Amino acid sequence: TLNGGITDMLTELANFEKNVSQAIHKYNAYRKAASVIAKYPHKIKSGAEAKKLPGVGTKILEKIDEFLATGKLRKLEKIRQDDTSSSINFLTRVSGIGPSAARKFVDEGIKTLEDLRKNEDKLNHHQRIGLKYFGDFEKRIPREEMLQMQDIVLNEVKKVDSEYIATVCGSFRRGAESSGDMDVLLTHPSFTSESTKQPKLLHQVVEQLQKVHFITDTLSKGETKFMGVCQLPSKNDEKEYPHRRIDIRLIPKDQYYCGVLYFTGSDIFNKNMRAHALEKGFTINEYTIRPLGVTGVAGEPLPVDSEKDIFDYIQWKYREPKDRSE
DNA sequence: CCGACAGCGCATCAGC
DNA sequence: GCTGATGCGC
DNA sequence: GTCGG
Numbered sequence: 449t450l451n452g453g454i455t456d457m458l459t460e461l462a463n464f465e466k467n468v469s470q471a472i473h474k475y476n477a478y479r480k481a482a483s484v485i486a487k488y489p490h491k492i493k494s495g496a497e498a499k500k501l502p503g504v505g506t507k508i509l510e511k512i513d514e515f516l517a518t519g520k521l522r523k524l525e526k527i528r529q530d531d532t533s534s535s536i537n538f539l540t541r542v543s544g545i546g547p548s549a550a551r552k553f554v555d556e557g558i559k560t561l562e563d564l565r566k567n568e569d570k571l572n573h574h575q576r577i578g579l580k581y582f583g584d585f586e587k588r589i590p591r592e593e594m595l596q597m598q599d600i601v602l603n604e605v606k607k608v609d610s611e612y613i614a615t616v617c618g619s620f621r622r623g624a625e626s627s628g629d630m631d632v633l634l635t636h637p638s639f640t641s642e643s644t645k646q647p648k649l650l651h652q653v654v655e656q657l658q659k660v661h662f663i664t665d666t667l668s669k670g671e672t673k674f675m676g677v678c679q680l681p682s683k684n685d686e687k688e689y690p691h692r693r694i695d696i697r698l699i700p701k702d703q704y705y706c707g708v709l710y711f712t713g714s715d716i717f718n719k720n721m722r723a724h725a726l727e728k729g730f731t732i733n734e735y736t737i738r739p740l741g742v743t744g745v746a747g748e749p750l751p752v753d754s755e756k757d758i759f760d761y762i763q764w765k766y767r768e769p770k771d772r773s774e
Numbered sequence: 775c776c777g778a779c780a781g782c783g784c785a786t787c788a789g790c
Numbered sequence: 791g792c793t794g795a796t797g798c799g800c
Numbered sequence: 801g802t803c804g805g
């Protein structure tokens with residue numbers, strides 16, 4: 449939090465560009481700038497100083513100068529006064545409402561939390577559950593609660609079939625003292641890049657987690673990706689825990705290391721690392737790392753037997769999960 | 775100056 | 791129905 | 801919005 453003021457301002461700008469302008473490159477530029485400044489280990493004294501960092505250019509440098517001189521940004525002060533922008537921004541805080549639906553709702557006079565509740569029939573399923581847990585989904589998850597949730601998930605997965613491996617990723621695997629949701633990577637020897645010798649591998653786990661009333665709602669679900677809602681059990685007379693977002697990603701077991709790399713993140717770390725792989729002539733996704741030929745077409749999967757193997761290919765020294773919080 | 779910006783699962787819709 | 795584009799969110 | 805070539 450050395451430069452928390454600056455990185456808050458850049459984040460609010462990124463959200464403005466994504467949600468209101470629908471200019472996704474400005475949104476990623478602002479977030480990259482915010483990220484490179486959050487890890488800069490000096491208290492920034494001028495835009496010139498910040499311009500030296502990659503991702504901060506002239507425009508952001510001027511904005512930082514204004515913010516340092518005045519403590520605020522006039523552009524953001526006007527944005528906060530604009531009722532249309534404020535309405536659109538607020539609606540995207542509901543899970544499943546992105547910039548397009550937010551502007552659609554605002555155009556029809558659906559602009560507050562009450563309005564969504566009275567127009568629940570204009571929402572799709574995901575958006576309906578997002579509204580239902582709107583307040584809970586804004587709460588952070590203490591790591592101590594993440595530890596209880598992991599113990600349930602792993603034990604219930606083990607009960608379905610002892611050959612499953614479930615791995616909690618996200619910021620929890622990076623060591624964070626609090627997480628926004630739970631991200632679970634799942635493998636089973638029956639599911640490899642060569643064959644799926646067992647159907648319903650993800651369904652069986654989801655079902656068992658619903659049976660014990662851990663999973664409470666479903667946002668979306670397919671053969672390899674589940675997104676939904678869970679809740680820890682409370683003791684007698686105790687207030688209930690908040691409802692929590694849970695994502696489960698079933699990945700072919702022989703592709704575990706690209707999967708765990710992807711699911712551990714952060715998202716900006718993935719973007720940097722994947723960008724760097726391109727510069728080095730490779731493409732990385734959650735399944736494989738592949739060379740790119742002279743035509744930039746993805747070649748065949750390269751052998752991977754560790755996270756570090758993926759770093760080696762692109763000539764990065766290995767970074768532990770705790771150092772990928774970008 | 776300007777092309778590229780990481781990569782992809784699931785939900786929904788439009789055209790057929 | 792399937793196919794492709796778009797939305798949304800990892 | 802930023803930047804590598």
Ligand SMILES: Cc1cn([C@H]2C[C@H](O)[C@@H](COP(=O)(O)OP(=O)(O)C(F)(F)P(=O)(O)O)O2)c(=O)[nH]c1=O
Pocket residue numbers: 617618619620626627628629630631710711712713714715718800
């Ligand atoms: C959102 C996002 C996620 N990911 C990867 C990287 C994340 O760490 C992983 C889990 O997504 P997440 O939205 O739960 O992020 P997170 O890192 O776990 C988090 F720190 F944002 P939080 O703990 O609050 O969920 O999916 C991407 O590669 N691209 C993305 O755009």
Ligand SMILES: [Cl-]
Pocket residue numbers: 470471472473474475
């Ligand atoms: Cl843009």
Ligand SMILES: [Cl-]
Pocket residue numbers: 702703704705706707735736752753
């Ligand atoms: Cl792998």
Ligand SMILES: [Mg+2]
Pocket residue numbers: 618619627628629630631
């Ligand atoms: Mg997460």
Ligand code: NA
Pocket residue numbers: 498499500501502503504505
């Ligand atoms: Na710079």
Ligand code: NA
Pocket residue numbers: 539540541542543544545546
């Ligand atoms: Na949203």
Ligand code: NA
Pocket residue numbers: 618629630631695800
């Ligand atoms: Na997640």
